[PDB]
Amino acid sequence: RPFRFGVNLVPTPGVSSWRETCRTAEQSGYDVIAVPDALGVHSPFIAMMAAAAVTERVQLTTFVLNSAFWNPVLLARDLLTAHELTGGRVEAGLGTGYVRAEFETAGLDWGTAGTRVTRLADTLAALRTLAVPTPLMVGGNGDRVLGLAAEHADTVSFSGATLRMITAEAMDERVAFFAERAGERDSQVERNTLVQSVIATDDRAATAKAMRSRMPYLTAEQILQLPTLLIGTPAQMAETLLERRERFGFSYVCVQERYLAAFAPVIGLL
């Protein structure tokens, strides 16, 4: 599947640079602007509308909605609106939330991991029943969550962390688990991952060795294979993404805002 590149931008209250940042993302060659769903961050669909007003090509996605925050019928109303009023430029990533304090602040029941995943399941079923027109992305690494992606999603997003970084070998197993659950639908589901750090260096080996300090549970060789890290020159990173599309099927690759400019050269090469 052809590469699609995203940058995960944080629209921040009290900061006046949102539209400028979105323009920079598009001008730097990104295909997608992703926004989070968190307290103390701008509201996602409203921020996506502001981004759509100053960009022409990028898709806009949530990455990812906290399912505890949304009534499925009212979310379907939001998604239909966002789709129609942007000319079909909005995608909706959904998942579970991991910050209990946000549940507490909003007056929502934290419950159990089981009830949080059931809420995601119930929302996805309702959105599909209501035939929402936005493409749906499901993110996580849990067995039930990947099963829900396999059943419902247009795009599955594999987390490269639990932050504890997951090895390439663990990622092999998660992608295979998803693929088995997806069955005949596997080929219709785009695969995404988020790269946490884009580390430009002329000495990847020396860089990985020093990084064992921050990831003592890994060898340097494992660090150089972690799907959540890109290390080296732009040419080396481009080659690494080609290899990881072959290995994992990852064609939709996102990076964090801090690395927007660091990663842009890789887009130029790919």
Residue numbers in the entry: 25 to 186, 196 to 303
Give the exact sentences the study uses for this entry.
Central to this pathway is PepI, an F420H2-dependent oxidoreductase. Among these, the homolog kvPepI from Kitasatospora viridis DSM44826, with 53.3% sequence identity to PepI, was more amenable to study.
Overlay of Adf-acetone adduct structure with kvPepI-F420 revealed that the keto group of the acetone adduct occupies a position similar to that of the ordered water (HOH570), suggesting that the highly conserved His62 acts as a general acid to protonate the keto group of 9. Accordingly, the H62A mutation abolished the PepI activity. To rule out the possibility of H62A mutation causing a loss of activity due to allosteric effects, we also solved the structures of kvPepIH62A and kvPepIH62A in complex with F420, which are virtually identical to kvPepI apo and kvPepI-F420 complex structures, respectively. Taken together, these findings strongly support the role of His62 as the proton-donating residue.
